[PDB]
């Protein structure tokens, strides 16, 4: 919880942790995390609404989310110190009331945008 | 200490109690009548003295100061990044030992540290005024320090590189074992230590402690900005024109980072303070652009963009900046299009390469130049440093001052087609650290043209079969660029049968308009959720508010998600279930559409007013400020 | 930053250092050390400047307020500045009876300094002896200055400087004091007009009072080819209905902004103007609807590009 950083531009948490999750189709994934990208000036289509685009990585490779990504966290491990931190994740997941509470790293595209 | 020699070239009497020779010298300089009174030997000495003082920018005394012109001119190929020219200078046979010293600095500047170490050892052998001997001893120890640091860095870190042979590594360790740079000046001839006392500071571990502590004045909130800048230029000119390898070390790079940043922040503070009282400062030049490019990291530039407004800073010598930018982009082609990559020269140059093009957002570039930078950035930049995700941002930044013309559009189209070419392999997948992919480049072209059709991509799309699935879904992110025939050909490969295929279609841009069928598919999912009541539900709600859906049978499912009913009918929504956290997830278009709804507006403006007062959140404050939501 | 919301620990140690810096002020300027002075006062000025965020005991406040008001040399801390230092000390400690006596002692001396017709007060910020008197009258309403009233009752017409000085402090004077003073002095000057509307002698501007404002305005007009801002606020607040001051635009930008907001050029608008305004006048500006959209842009710019949090508070409380 000493590496735990709360970003306030998107109400998510940055934490060096992995996730073992199961979707609504019983599929299992091990050692997976997420990365969020704040790009407020993205060239949106007529149907883009979310200000942040999130990529899910498992085993060092990004996932193509072809199905519904509703999921539950079964075991969250903090990478630097192998102590199980799942109880903190679920406690934090309820509070923020936002999709994908804990994220491996947040990328801010605002400061690099030419319209910044 | 008999006089002060100020950075603007004005001499001030300080501590001498004898005859004033500096005042007398300047009187001899201004008027030629007294010059003929000197002897012939003293006449040629005065001419040599006069040449030295005008070359070093020491013009006259403080009380005779008039229209002072302090323009920085660094006569060094190394500072300007003339990589080709120094190579030619190295190749040529060196006439004198002074040329060898310039060569060894150029070899060090070009990453050939083993050759410079050998050259510096050679110069030391043949140089026992003895000033080049001392400077070579300083530089050989410096390059030995650089080699030792690089070996440690390479052992710690993308692929295993061995630029220095272990025989060379063992040799320099045996030559530099128990080598004291501190005793170097004291062991010099006593004539040298008297004549060249000003060169002693080069043997110290740190030599910019004085310049860094004087930087504290730039934070004063009560000229000095010219003094810090001219002191910076003095340090640059001495370290480059005299070819001293300490100019590439961390202490000097950090000092330029500290001095340049604080000068920029101080000017930013003066502007805001002026507007507060006057109610409506720093002017960068070619040298400032080089200093920021060479010494600032991308993070360090990022700290600059957030703190101040460089768009308010006007850039001069833009053709010289462009010449620097076309000159640097040429070297990337030489480094990577050919097999000329120098792994040691790689590490130092790419950081300057990344910073220059990142900072190239604020400069107006000609078309022929802009093509060279874009083509070098898009194609020849290695993916390890500038990946696909970061590279577009570097490319997209160049559009701030240069609105994308046809020729640059062709280059990006060339990049997109080449990206499609690598997708013949099923294993190939774009890796982006910014969550940003080849779709974003095509969106940029469609943003700047709105009518561009990719002919070569159309040919690739029409050639597609059901087998090479990696190519099919890749070009679905490039649908607007394809022709109608290519669009019709591609659409046959995906189906929209169930609701999940609709979301996949909406995410990849497969369809941008809602035929009534998807509304029923949209409708079918919601009734199942309503039946199964006792992620997407919030997503559907926004589309109805964004006028994406005109089915008007959306109100049956009001009551499950607080975001759903918040969007379907703002007038009937209860705002005690409102959570301010949603507005942080909303993009520019959606927030603006909420602002002009004339409903929901006074509720959210109240929730934003409450949040900023209670929490003082900048994101909430800026969301409220920009769109008045 | 909001330092007032930052808690201060070890308060008694801070106070002891503050009273100690106060005793040295008295000792130096009552056997002065000119070399010691040049380094000490900068610390002394800052320590008393920062003492606003410090809760101080009544005995401790008495020592510091005595040194600040009396033994602090006029060369650096002028009477206008010295009021501000004194005023900030009231943020955490409401003015007690022991402290309030010290301030009247200063005013009696200030009246004594005004027995000489040559003496005049110099203030960089424009605050004078009348502004401490407001600070006396702010905390306790029914305060009468016994010693100042005594000088008021002994006044003659010859010592004019006492007459003009005591009128600015009129609330503090007793009923017999003000009646004697009102017999000796009448409100007849443009400076007297502002002092009367400030102390409370006059409530609504009489037609003669507008004539004084007009005559100064034509005097300014002929000199054109800082009371202008005060006049514009008076008109924009509708307390004045004379409606001839539209002929007197152009000298300073603050006036033109208030008198005719629609025709004002807001490129010459100064953001720092919003800070000097009070709650009622700020609310009137937001309710004018003629400049509201223009000043929205100015305030929105300032919060973006300036570090002052006052603008955000002004924007959020009134939406000016």
The token pair at A27 is 């599929």
Residues of chain B contacting A113 with CB distance shorter than 8 Å: 393, 396-397
Give the distance between the most distant pair of CA atoms in chain A.
44
Query: Do B281 and B267 touch, CB atoms closer than 8 A?
Result: yes
Query: Do A60 and A104 touch, CB atoms closer than 8 A?
Result: no
C residues 218-277 near B, CB within 8 Å?
A: 267-272
Q: How far apart are CA B156 and CA B159, in angstroms?
A: 10
User: In angstroms, what separates the C-alpha of C319 from chain B's closest C-alpha?
Assistant: 11
Residues of chain B contacting C305 with CB distance shorter than 8 Å: 272, 275, 309
Q: Is C293 on the interface with B (CB under 8 A)?
A: no
Nearest CA to B430 out of B418, B444, B414, B447 is that of B418
3-state SS, one letter per residue, for chain C: CCHHHCCCCCHHHHHHHHHHHHHHHHHHCCCCCHHHHHHHHHHHHHHHHHHHHCCCCHHHHHHHHHHHHHHCCCCCCCHHHHHHHHHHCCCCCCCCHHHHHHHHHHHHHHHHHCCCCCCCCCCCCCCCHHHHHHHHHHHCCCCCCHHHHHHHHCCCCCCHHHHHHHHHCHHHCCHHHHHHHHHHCCCCCHHHHHHHHHHCCCCCCCHHHHHHHHHHHHHHHHHHCCCHHHHHHHHHCCCCCCCCHHHHCCCCHHHHHHHCCCCCCHHHCCCCHHHHCCHHHHHHHHCCCCCHHHHHHHHHHHHHHCCCCHHHHHHHHHCC
Nearest to A43 among B435, B447, B548 (CB): B447
Residues of chain B contacting C270 with CB distance shorter than 8 Å: 277-279
**B548: closest chain A residue by CA:** A47
Query: Do A90 and A74 touch, CB atoms closer than 8 A?
Result: no
Radius of gyration of chain C (CA): 22
Q: Is A81 on the interface with B (CB under 8 A)?
A: no
Q: Under an 8 A CB cutoff, do A37 and B587 touch?
A: no
Q: How far apart are CA C281 and CA C264, in angstroms?
A: 18
Query: Do B400 and B370 touch, CB atoms closer than 8 A?
Result: no
What is the per-residue burial (b if ≥16 Cβ within 10 Å, else e) of B315-329?
A: bebbebbbebbbbbb
The token pair at C255 is 């006036």
- C279 CB-near residues (< 8 Å, 6+ apart): none
Nearest to B279 among C269, C304, C308 (CB): C269
H helical segments located in B380-454: 388-397, 406-421, 438-449
Hey, of B270, B279, B623, B624, which one would you mutate to test binding to chain C, going by the most C CBs within 10 A of its CB?
B279
- Distance (Å) of CA C39 to CA C30, C45, C71, C72: 18, 11, 17, 14
Nearest CA to C66 out of C36, C35, C33, C109 is that of C109
Residue B69 per-residue DSSP state? -
Q: Is B389 helix (H, G, I), strand (E, B) or coil?
A: helix
Q: Which helix (H) or strand (E) is B32 found in, with range? A: none
- B156 CB-near residues (< 8 Å, 6+ apart): none
Residue with tokens 């606020």: C233
Q: Please count the CA atoms within 13 angstroms of the CA of C288 that sit on its side-chain side.
A: 26
What is the per-residue burial (b if ≥16 Cβ within 10 Å, else e) of B240-261?
A: bebbbbbbbbeebbebbbbbbb
**A70: closest chain B residue by CA:** B535
Q: How far apart are CA B23 and CA B189, in angstroms?
A: 32
Residues of chain B contacting A36 with CB distance shorter than 8 Å: 435
- B308 CB-near residues (< 8 Å, 6+ apart): B264, B265, B267, B268
Q: Under an 8 A CB cutoff, do C316 and B609 touch?
A: yes
Q: Under an 8 A CB cutoff, do B625 and C304 touch?
A: yes
Neighbours of C214 (CB within 10 A): 16
Query: Do A62 and B435 touch, CB atoms closer than 8 A?
Result: no
Cα A68 → chain centroid = 16
The token pair at B310 is 């460089």
Pairing of strands A12-14, A102-103: parallel
Query: Do C273 and C287 touch, CB atoms closer than 8 A?
Result: no
Nearest to B613 among C304, C308, C316 (CB): C316
Query: Do A36 and A52 touch, CB atoms closer than 8 A?
Result: yes
User: In angstroms, what separates the C-alpha of A31 from chain B's closest C-alpha?
Assistant: 18
H helical segments located in A21-77: none
Angle ∠(A6,A8,A12) on CA atoms, nearest 5: 55
Q: How far apart are CA B283 and CA B392, in angstroms?
A: 28
Neighbours of B121 (CB within 10 A): 15
Pairing of strands A52-58, A28-38: antiparallel
- B266 CB-near residues (< 8 Å, 6+ apart): B218, B219, B225, B282
- Distance (Å) of CA B217 to CA B6, B225, B226, B423, B624: 17, 9, 12, 56, 37
Nearest CA to C294 out of C254, C314, C265 is that of C265
- Chains with 3 or more CB pairs under 8 A to chain C: B
Hey, of C6, C270, C298, C319, which one would you mutate to test binding to chain B, going by the most B CBs within 10 A of its CB?
C270
The token pair at C242 is 């004379």
Cα B261 → chain centroid = 14
Neighbours of C202 (CB within 10 A): 15
Neighbours of C238 (CB within 10 A): 8
Q: How far apart are CA B235 and CA C160, in angstroms?
A: 66
Query: Do A40 and B590 touch, CB atoms closer than 8 A?
Result: no
- Distance (Å) of CA B257 to CA B209, B232, B294, B296, B489: 14, 11, 10, 6, 54
Give the distance between the most distant pair of CA atoms in chain B.
111
Query: Do A116 and A106 touch, CB atoms closer than 8 A?
Result: no
Q: How far apart are CA B626 and CA B587, in angstroms?
A: 12
- B454 CB-near residues (< 8 Å, 6+ apart): B413, B416, B417, B442, B478, B481, B482
Q: How far apart are CA B442 and CA B413, in angstroms?
A: 8
The token pair at C168 is 């600015």
φ, ψ at A36 (rounded to 5°): -110, 145
Q: How far apart are CA C167 and CA C182, in angstroms?
A: 8
Residues of chain C contacting B310 with CB distance shorter than 8 Å: none
Q: Which helix (H) or strand (E) is B469 found in, with range? A: helix B469-476
Nearest CA to B563 out of B581, B578, B543, B546 is that of B578
Pairing of strands A17-23, A12-14: unpaired
Q: Which helix (H) or strand (E) is A55 found in, with range? A: strand A52-58
The token pair at A8 is 């306030």
Give resolution, Å, one decimal: 2.6
Q: How far apart are CA C165 and CA B5, in angstroms?
A: 56
φ, ψ at A14 (rounded to 5°): -100, 120
Q: How far apart are CA A74 and CA A76, in angstroms?
A: 7
Q: How far apart are CA B255 and CA B244, in angstroms?
A: 16
Strands of the sheet containing A5-7, edge to edge, are: A5-7, A12-14, A102-103
């Amino acid at each position: 919880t000493h590496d735990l950083v709360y970003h306030s531009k998107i109400n998510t948490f940055v934490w060096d942790v992995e996730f073992d999750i199961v979707l609504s189709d019983s599929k299992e994934l091990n050692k997976c995390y997420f990365v969020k990208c704040f790009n407020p000036y993205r060239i949106n289509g007529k149907c883009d609404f979310a200000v942040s685009s999130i990529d899910i990585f498992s085993e060092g490779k990004r996932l193509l989310i072809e199905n519904e990504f509703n999921f539950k966290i079964t075991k969250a491990v903090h990478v630097a110190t192998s102590k199980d931190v799942t109880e903190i994740v679920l406690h934090l997941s309820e509070r923020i009331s936002s999709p994908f509470p804990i994220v491996k790293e947040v990328v801010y595209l605002d400061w690099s945008h030419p319209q910044f | 200490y008999d006089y002060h020699f100020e950075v603007n070239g004005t001499v001030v009497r300080h501590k001498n109690k004898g005859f004033g020779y500096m005042e007398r010298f300047f009187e001899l300089k201004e008027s030629c009548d007294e010059r003929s009174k000197l002897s012939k030997k003293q006449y040629e000495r005065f001419n040599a003295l006069f040449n030295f003082f005008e070359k070093n920018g020491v013009i006259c005394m403080a009380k005779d100061a008039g229209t002072l012109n302090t323009s920085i001119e660094i006569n060094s190929l190394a500072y300007h990044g003339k990589y080709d020219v120094m190579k030619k200078f190295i190749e040529e046979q060196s006439v004198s030992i002074e040329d060898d010293y310039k060569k060894a600095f150029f070899l060090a500047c070009l990453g050939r540290w083993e050759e410079s170490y050998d050259l510096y050892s050679n110069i030391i052998l043949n140089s026992i005024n003895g000033c080049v001997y001392y400077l070579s001893q300083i530089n050989r120890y410096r390059i030995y320090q650089s080699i030792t640091q690089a070996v440690t860095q390479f052992n710690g870190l993308g692929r295993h590189y061995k630029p220095f042979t272990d025989e060379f590594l063992a040799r320099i360790e045996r030559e530099m074992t128990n080598f004291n740079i501190d005793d170097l000046f004291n062991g010099m001839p006593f004539e040298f230590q008297k004549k060249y006392k000003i060169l002693e500071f080069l043997s110290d571990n740190q030599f910019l402690y004085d310049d860094t502590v004087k930087l504290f004045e730039l934070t004063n909130k009560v000229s000095s900005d010219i003094v810090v800048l001219l002191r910076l230029y003095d340090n640059l000119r001495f370290l480059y024109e005299n070819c001293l390898w300490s100019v590439s070390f961390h202490e000097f790079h950090q000092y330029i980072r500290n001095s340049m940043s604080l000068l920029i922040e101080k000017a930013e503070y003066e502007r805001t303070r002026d507007i507060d009282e006057l109610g409506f400062g720093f002017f960068m030049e070619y040298y400032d652009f080089v200093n920021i490019s060479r010494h600032f990291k991308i993070d360090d530039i990022k700290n600059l963009e957030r703190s101040c407004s460089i768009d308010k800073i006007r850039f001069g010598e833009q053709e010289k900046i462009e010449e620097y930018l076309v000159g640097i982009a040429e070297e990337i082609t030489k480094q990577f299009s050919a097999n000329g990559m120098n792994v040691v020269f790689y590490t130092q140059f790419i950081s300057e390469a990344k910073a220059a093009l990142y900072f190239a957002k604020y400069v107006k570039l000609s078309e022929e130049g802009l093509g060279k930078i874009v083509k070098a950035l898009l194609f020849y930049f290695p993916e390890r440093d500038l990946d696909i995700g970061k590279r577009y941002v570097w490319l997209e930044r160049l559009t701030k001052c240069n609105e994308l013309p046809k020729s640059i559009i062709s280059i990006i189209d060339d990049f997109l087609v080449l990206q499609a070419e690598k997708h013949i392999d099923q294993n190939y997948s774009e890796v982006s650290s910014n969550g940003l992919y080849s779709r974003d480049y095509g969106a940029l072209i469609k943003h700047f043209e709105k009518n561009f059709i990719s002919k070569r991509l159309s040919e690739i799309t029409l050639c597609l079969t059901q087998d090479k699935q990696k190519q099919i879904d890749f070009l679905f992110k490039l649908l607007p660029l394809l022709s109608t025939n290519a669009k019709s050909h591609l659409l046959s490969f995906k189906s929209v049968e169930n609701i999940n295929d609709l979301m996949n279609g909406i995410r990849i841009g497969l369809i941008d308009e809602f035929t009534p069928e998807h509304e029923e598919l949209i409708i079918e999912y919601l009734e199942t959720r309503k039946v199964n009541y006792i992620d997407y539900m919030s997503t559907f709600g926004i589309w109805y508010f964004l006028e994406e859906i005109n089915n008007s049978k959306m109100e049956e499912f009001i009551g499950m998600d607080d975001q759903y009913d918040f969007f379907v009918d703002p007038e009937n929504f209860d705002y005690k279930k409102f959570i301010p956290s949603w507005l942080k997830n909303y993009n520019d278009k959606l927030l603006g559409k909420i602002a002009g709804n004339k409903h929901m507006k006074h509720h959210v403006i109240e929730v934003l007013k409450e949040r900023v007062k209670n929490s003082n959140d900048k994101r909430y404050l800026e969301i409220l400020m920009n769109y008045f939501i």
